[PDB]
């Protein structure tokens, strides 16, 4: 956590329904963005941090 | 209805899903409450269910 | 010396351009344009944005 | 392993995101359709509706 990893995603398609959909995560929690409006949204600056 | 333990945040109102969409959906405007709980004694068996 | 009526004119066109200015603003909203909001949020906190 | 939940290690990733303010890069799996012109349409331009 003190050194977490940051990785810029850009120039993709993201299919996040696929994320949405499988169930083995607990913890889903958007926001500022609805959880099953991300299919249908375009996006920049994106990052995950892991 | 009988679904797996991780499913029980799909049955909500206004939630995409496979037991959502092709199951079990509920109104934007639903009101009423849900129950859930485990089965595993009963609804469960050594050689699968 | 006709600057009654040229203000007359001003006050009417200044109150409208003033309307017209006011739908750049937020309220307290994530965002000033309504098709965002549906767009981002579930219904529950839509409606209130 | 041996201890109880709150304690067991969680794995947290953060998508962090900015909404409609650059050209964007990363879209959903929506089909692009056709454009009409001088005709009154419903648009959606990268999430602009």
Known sequence: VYAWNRKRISNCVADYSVLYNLAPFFTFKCYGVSPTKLNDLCFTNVYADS | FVIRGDEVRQIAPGQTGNIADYNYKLPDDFTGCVIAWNSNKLDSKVSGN | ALGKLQDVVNHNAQALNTLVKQLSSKFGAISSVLNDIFSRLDPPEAEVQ | ?49
């Open chain 4, 1 to 49: 392993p041996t201890y109880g939940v709150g304690h067991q290690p969680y794995r947290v990733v953060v998508l962090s995101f900015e909404l409609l303010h650059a050209p964007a890069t990363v879209c959903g799996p929506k089909k692009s359709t056709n454009l009409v012109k001088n005709k009154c349409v419903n648009f959606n331009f990268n999430g602009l509706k």
